[PDB]
Design a protein around this ligand. Sequence first.
Ligand SMILES: CCCCC[C@H](CC(=O)NO)C(=O)N[C@H](C(=O)N1CCC[C@H]1CO)C(C)C
Ligand SMILES: CCCCC[C@H](CC(=O)NO)C(=O)N[C@H](C(=O)N1CCC[C@H]1CO)C(C)C
Lengths: 158, 158
Amino acid sequence: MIRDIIRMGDKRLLRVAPQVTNLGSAELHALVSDMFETMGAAHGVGLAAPQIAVDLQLMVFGFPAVPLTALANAQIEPLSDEMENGWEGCLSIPGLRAVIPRYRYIRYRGFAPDGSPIEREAEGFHARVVQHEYDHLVGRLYPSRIENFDTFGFDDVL
Amino acid sequence: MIRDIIRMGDKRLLRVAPQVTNLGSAELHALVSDMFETMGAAHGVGLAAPQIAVDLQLMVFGFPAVPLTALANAQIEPLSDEMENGWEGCLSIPGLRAVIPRYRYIRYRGFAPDGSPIEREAEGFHARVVQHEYDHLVGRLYPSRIENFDTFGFDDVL
Ligand SMILES: CCCCC[C@H](CC(=O)NO)C(=O)N[C@H](C(=O)N1CCC[C@H]1CO)C(C)C
Ligand SMILES: CCCCC[C@H](CC(=O)NO)C(=O)N[C@H](C(=O)N1CCC[C@H]1CO)C(C)C
């Protein structure tokens, strides 16, 4: 079932989401299913549970190919100090883009929907997507990370 | 003649505009006329010449009533350190609002389109409008002035 994506300005995007505690459940599987569907319909490369007003530490992503992944209770460690700029837009902020600095190299850990542990090293785009979806789980959006405001503008214009 | 308002992301909104040097001219009067018209059609309380891709130190405004004013070669002095928060949206950024801190009290100086000198003390909303239009003449947009990003979001949602 495709879900309504909520837009910036909604308080539910500013929460810090609790953990998933129903790994392996039919409810979690249905919810993840919906997230993949909602992501594909909206043409995103990532989607975070709060964007559909589900207050859960949960994200999906996949697209430099990134594997199709569902990740619960994500935690993230930078593997170095190196930052990299790249373009981002948020489906909660349709039409806009900015250049965002992110870690070039990360580790991420959590759980696949069935309970399998996931741990991966990621770089570049793969790392960016995960850092972006992570920010949602802690009530953080990309505009508060913009350093150069000349780069912030509408996609069709920029 | 109503003018197309250009949107954030356009480089022409990032310029520092030169001075008006044709006070009292038919060309300036036509341009100001157009600005008042474009402002009214877009339902704004202010409009700055760069927003219609005219690279000129020129703004219009008027709406706590603010008088209907056309102001060329504006310069602005704070009359105190006191800041005040208020909501703003920009016709170059349709749909969005944020809370922006501005001086509560200003002086502004320039010229009416016919050459008459204008100097005024302004406070609160009147002062905000002028500070906002001023920022456009120096390539500055409100998002780079946001302090609390929780307040940045879409009008219909916020
Ligand atoms: C890149 C950081 C990950 C962004 C995630 C968003 C989706 C989203 O809002 N997730 O929470 C997305 O798919 N955004 C895309 C995006 O920003 N892209 C697509 C490819 C490159 C990059 C900038 O263009 C498009 C739909 C705007
Ligand atoms: C308040 C600072 C002046 C903003 C000027 C803008 C117009 C603009 O983009 N000028 O350069 C406007 O009219 N914005 C309005 C606006 O921000 N308003 C209308 C009244 C109160 C305030 C916030 O709601 C509406 C159309 C979004």
